[PDB]
Write a protein that binds this DNA or RNA. Structure first.
Lengths: 123, 78, 82, 144, 80, 162, 383, 95
RNA sequence: GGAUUUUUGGAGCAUCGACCUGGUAUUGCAGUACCUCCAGGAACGGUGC
């Protein structure tokens, strides 16, 4: 599975340097008798592979290391600790929201299993 | 192909009772009920081997709405 | 306890009272701090007695050696049983 | 209190731990001390009653779509969403004859259930989380 | 009372045994017998005017040991 | 099959015929010698018979070693850092090698404590003035190819290549 | 190699994995002080590795500015991609899937149930950096410093309480002279205090704190950090008073003050820096010193038993029944049986029936003792 | 038994080690001479019949020649000294 | 585990191994200290006092 991953990485590297949505380096290669099944959205890996192209967008950021140098994430451990604490607080808030959604689903299942299903009214 | 797995049975069910329950849809050639010899209780699952695969498939497809001791019994192909 | 029998039949190095070190397979011991070192070799350091001379250690193998407890100072484990 | 020594039907003593027999009473107490006995010992409703029922007037509107019913409900001031479910016409208050169709009914806690009969077998899905929605800002239920 | 019983009831203690011929072995003493045989593991031995080597295990006898040194976090009333 | 710590730990280490600790490692065909520091300086002779070592290099610092047996191998080149790893090396058995040029013995003269040498059955010995060049390169070697050095051979080595 | 496309994305993914591992370590609750100290040391090592990875990725920008004109050009495109696909058109006979492209940094930055330690931090141990008397930052070892002070003072009239009272001062009068032999012990005590402060908090920035301490020693402590109302301005090195600020500024550049004394700013600058570091360590870690003094007082006021309690915290059955005898059954795929009665019980079972149903022979009583397939086929054809 | 313990107590209170009995009575410092010319000044917390002493907060002083030898000394919190290296034991030291 | 054999302490000279050149007889089957004799040079090392 290394050759398919390398081909997907090469397609994500060649498709990130495009100036339009349809005028890329992979749309013209489909008509050049080159079999590329990773371009269709029906595949299971392409939804990750285009996400790898989003990782190519992570290589296309101006503070990513192309024209500037990061100083808070590279020369400040306190900023990284504050970012880790904010990520832990966001994960705790997401877990609390998931617990509230599970409690709401349990309350809806308790209310749906206790209602009267014999009072039928056709208007 | 001729053996069907019956699960979801209580511990109070016996092997002649399971044979009499399975004989209502077809004559079963053999019935194996795995049980622990240390405690002497059933595991709630058994395997009924009939004389043919079509009769076993019909007995597995016709026992989808069987209830024993308040518990629904499930039949699958094995 | 049985701490002396735990390192049996291993290549142990016992330090002598004169400064030499005898390394050998400590197979048998006793209550009088004796040791039966099979295929043992004794190494003794020599004094340079000069300003530019280095410190050397002459080593000679003797085989099975019966070391008493009056000369043994401390024994250290050096090699596992082959 | 020995849980292994029992009395048989012949006036003797039986040890089920080591499966031994003893005729007199002096042999049962002397059988516990030994190697075999030591080896055998070592080897071994509230939400339904509190729901108000006033039966108000519902406002349901159907529309034949192609690729949907819309119910206008008042403000319930609660997080309980109205649930839709498909049932049969065999269970009723009067049990009228010639009832062999299905009916999808939507029920809420402050309001009554609105039911619509479907003559077709399967043309849509009556699932609550698949093709249903309930806008609380406008308080409107949609079922597709 | 003999002092061998106070030294035999010592386990996982970082002590330092100074020998007679200018040798000092500092390490965690793991075993002590009635004949003052000190068996230690992962100790450091320093001889007379020599470099301190490190040994994974050592066994000093009773007649070769000259003095002992215990840390300050060790009561002497409960060991005697 | 490469040489590792498991090949040295499972080897048979005993007493040799010269009253020294030797570990037998014959019949291994190791292409490279590495990770030999597991002996913890408890051996005096290391045998490397029937090996496919192309170059004698990658030896750790061992002060207790006094004999090297690299016979029956395919060593064509020799390493330069051999004196800093074995300061007490006295015996060197480099017989049946692939040495062709006379410059291969120039890192071999760095060992000052070397007294025994064996360069027999080698193509470097077939050339002219090979023993004189070996005597002029390493004067501390007293026995070369099971033969003692000579005074006339030392005079011819000091006279030639002036 | 794609140093700006693939390597930068790999470094960003490694930094995101390190940040996720640090957030998972910080979000989990702690129950012991040693496990919390080990988790803090692992988080500090992960932060140092992430800083090293960011410093290695930040230097890969020299060739990116020259290659950005050719990578973003519209004249290029599928030609280099087709050349790279033709170069990667080798034999694919190595049928082996490698799912460790992204799961291996996720598993390397995690811990196990038996040992709560990371894969780069598997060889780390809390016993190699802290002693048993310190308690992994709970207390401070001051027995060796008290022994060194008693050896330097050459008097047995100084106990541990007197040494703790003398070490608690920050700007008071010293117990000995500044030009005496106590500075060599004070520098070692300041180094031990700095090592204990660095080991007690591994997640704090030690280099920034050292730079701030050096800036406070240079810009403030060298310019009259202790004002007065000889009592107006005092010097830490020269140990002399001053009338006003202008006289102190004129005497700061004097010839006995520069190199014409035994305690000037040229030779006694390291001792003054060590004294400032010891004062900063006493002001920053005063609570740990107070807890160590309270523990020493509790150990001294207790008895021997309380101090000892505080410092400690069958073949015959197989031979008679016919077992352990190898028997081969050629009907059920030449299976092995360890008993004649066991083979007779397994002959009328489901496994032998399923083995015989593949050949077409029904399960009857005539094929009970049948073992070979040819004899069973002959018995089936004869009936 | 009890009689042997009473005889050992009488031999420790009225024998040659009775000055050692002064080390555990009033907690006075004693001067012990070693075989390596190292004088140990300090009180004895525990003793035995084989002259094995347990010293607490002792000071070991010796002479080491680098000329003239210097009196390099050290201070130990707790130490144990065997009776084989004990040469001379002084009850009341000078300083 | 407190006093003669083990664990509660006796704490420039002599000798031996070698290094390098010359003449001389033994060509031999064995578990071993050692191993033919003489002359010249040494600016090699170990132990005791």
């Amino acid at each position: 599975s290394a050759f398919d991953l390398d081909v997907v990485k090469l397609t994500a590297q060649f498709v990130a340097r495009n100036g339009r949505q349809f005028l890329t380096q992979l749309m013209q290669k489909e008509q050049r008798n080159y079999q590329f099944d990773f371009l269709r959205p029906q595949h299971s890996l392409f939804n990750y592979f285009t996400k790898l192209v989003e990782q190519y967008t992570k290589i296309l950021i101006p503070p990513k290391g192309l024209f500037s140098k990061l100083k808070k994430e590279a020369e400040n451990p306190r900023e990284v600790l504050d970012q880790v604490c904010y990520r832990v607080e966001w994960a705790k808030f997401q877990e609390r929201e998931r617990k509230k959604e599970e409690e709401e689903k349990e309350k809806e299942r308790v209310a749906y299993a206790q209602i009267d299903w014999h009072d039928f009214v056709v208007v | 192909d001729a053996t069907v797995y019956v699960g979801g049975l209580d511990e109070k069910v016996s092997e002649p009772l399971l044979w009499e329950l399975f004989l209502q849809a077809g004559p079963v050639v053999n019935t194996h009920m795995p049980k622990d010899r240390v405690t002497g209780q059933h595991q709630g699952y058994g395997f009924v081997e009939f004389l043919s695969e079509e009769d076993a498939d019909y007995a597995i497809k016709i026992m989808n709405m069987i209830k024993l001791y308040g518990k629904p019994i499930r039949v699958n192909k094995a | 306890s049985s701490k002396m029998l735990q390192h049996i039949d291993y290549r142990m190095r016992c330090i002598l009272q004169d400064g030499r070190i005898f390394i050998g397979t400590f197979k048998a011991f006793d209550k009088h701090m004796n040791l039966i070192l099979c295929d043992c070799d004794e190494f003794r350091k020599i004094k340079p007695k000069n300003s530019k001379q280095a410190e050397r250690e002459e080593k000679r193998v003797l085989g099975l050696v019966l070391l008493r407890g009056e000369n043994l100072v401390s024994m250290t484990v050096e090699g596992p049983p082959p | 209190k020995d849980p292994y020594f029992m009395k048989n039907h012949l006036g003797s003593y039986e040890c089920k731990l080591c499966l031994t027999l003893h005729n007199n009473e002096g042999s049962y107490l002397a059988h516990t001390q030994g190697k075999k006995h030591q080896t055998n010992l070592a080897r071994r409703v509230e939400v339904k009653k509190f729901v108000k029922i006033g039966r108000p007037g519902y406002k349901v509107t159907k529309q034949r779509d192609s690729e949907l019913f819309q119910i206008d409900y008042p403000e319930i001031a609660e997080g309980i969403m109205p649930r839709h479910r498909f049932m049969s016409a065999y269970e009723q208050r009067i049990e009228p004859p010639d009832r062999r169709w299905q009916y999808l009914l939507m029920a809420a806690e402050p309001y009554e259930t609105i039911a619509f009969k479907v003559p077709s077998r399967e043309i849509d899905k009556a699932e609550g989380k698949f093709w249903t929605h309930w806008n609380r800002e406008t308080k409107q239920f949609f079922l597709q | 009372m003999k002092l061998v019983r106070f030294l035999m009831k010592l386990s996982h203690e970082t002590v330092t045994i100074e020998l007679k011929n200018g040798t000092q072995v500092h390490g965690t003493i793991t075993g002590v017998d009635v004949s003052m045989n000190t068996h230690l593991k992962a100790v450091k031995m320093t001889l007379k005017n020599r470099e301190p080597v490190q040994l994974e295990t050592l066994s000093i006898r009773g007649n070769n040991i000259r003095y002992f040194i215990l840390p300050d976090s060790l009561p002497l009333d409960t060991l005697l | 099959v490469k040489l590792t710590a498991e090949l040295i730990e499972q080897a048979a280490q005993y007493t040799n015929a010269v009253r020294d600790r030797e570990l037998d490692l014959r019949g291994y065909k190791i292409p490279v010698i590495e990770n030999l520091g597991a002996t913890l300086d408890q051996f005096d002779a290391i045998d490397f018979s029937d090996n496919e070592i192309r170059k004698l290099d990658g030896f750790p610092l061992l002060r207790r070693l006094k004999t090297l047996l690299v016979n029956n191998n395919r060593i064509c080149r020799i390493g330069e850092g051999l004196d800093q790893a074995l300061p007490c090396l006295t015996e060197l058995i480099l017989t049946n090698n692939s040495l062709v040029e006379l410059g291969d013995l120039d890192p071999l003269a760095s060992l000052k404590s070397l007294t025994y040498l064996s360069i027999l059955r080698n193509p470097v010995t077939n050339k002219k003035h090979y023993r004189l060049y070996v005597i002029y390169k390493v004067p501390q070697v007293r026995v070369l190819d099971f033969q003692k050095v000579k005074l006339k051979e030392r005079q011819e080595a000091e006279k030639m290549f002036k | 190699m794609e140093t700006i496309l693939e390597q930068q994305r790999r470094y960003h993914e490694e930094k995101e994995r390190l940040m996720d591992v640090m957030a998972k370590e910080m979000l989990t609750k702690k129950s012991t002080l040693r496990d919390q100290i080990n988790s803090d040391h692992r988080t500090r090592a992960m932060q140092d590795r992430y800083m090293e990875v960011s410093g290695n990725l930040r230097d890969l920008y020299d060739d990116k500015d020259g290659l950005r004109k050719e990578e973003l050009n519209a004249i290029s495109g599928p030609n280099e991609f087709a050349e790279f696909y033709n170069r990667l058109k080798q034999i694919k006979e190595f049928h082996r899937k490698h799912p460790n492209e992204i799961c291996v940094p996720m598993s390397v930055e995690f811990e196990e149930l038996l040992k709560a330690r990371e894969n780069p931090s598997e060889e780390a141990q809390n016993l190699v950096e802290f002693t048993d008397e310190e308690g992994y930052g709970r207390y401070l070892d001051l027995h060796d410093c008290y022994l060194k002070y008693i050896n330097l003072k050459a008097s047995e009239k100084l106990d541990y309480i007197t040494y703790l009272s003398i070490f608690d001062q920050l700007f008071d009068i010293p117990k000995e002279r500044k030009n005496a032999e106590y500075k060599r012990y004070l520098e070692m005590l300041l180094e031990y205090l700095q090592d204990y402060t660095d080991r007690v908090k591994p997640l704090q920035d030690q280099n920034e704190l050292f730079g701030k301490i050096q800036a406070e020693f240079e810009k403030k402590w060298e310019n009259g950090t202790f004002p007065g109302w000889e009592e107006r301005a005092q010097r830490l090195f020269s140990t002399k008073g001053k009338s006003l600020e202008s006289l102190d500024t004129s005497l700061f550049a004097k010839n006995p003050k520069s190199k014409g004394t035994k305690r000037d700013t040229e030779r006694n600058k390291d001792i003054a820096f060590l004294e400032a570091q010891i004062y900063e360590y006493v002001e920053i870690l005063g609570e740990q010193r107070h807890l160590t003094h309270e523990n020493v007082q509790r150990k001294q006021a207790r008895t021997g038993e309380e101090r000892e309690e505080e410092e400690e915290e069958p073949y015959w059955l197989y031979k008679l029944h016919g077992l352990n005898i190898n028997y081969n059954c050629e009907i059920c795929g030449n299976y092995t049986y360890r008993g004649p009665k066991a083979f007779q019980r397994h002959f009328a079972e489901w496994r032998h029936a399923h083995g015989m149903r593949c050949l077409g022979i029904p399960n009857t009583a005539h094929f009970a003792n049948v073992t070979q397939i040819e004899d069973a086929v002959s018995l089936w054809a004869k009936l | 038994p009890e009689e042997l313990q009473k005889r050992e107590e009488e031999e420790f209170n009225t024998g040659p080690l009775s000055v050692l009995t002064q080390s555990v009575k009033n907690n006075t410092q004693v001067l012990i001479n070693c075989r390596n010319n190292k004088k140990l000044l300090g009180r004895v917390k525990a003793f035995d019949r084989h002259c094995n002493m347990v010293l607490e907060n002792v000071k070991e002083m010796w002479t080491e020649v680098p000329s003239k030898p210097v009196n390099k000394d050290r201070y130990i919190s707790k130490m144990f000294l065997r009776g084989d290296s004990v040469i001379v034991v002084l009850r009341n030291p000078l300083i």
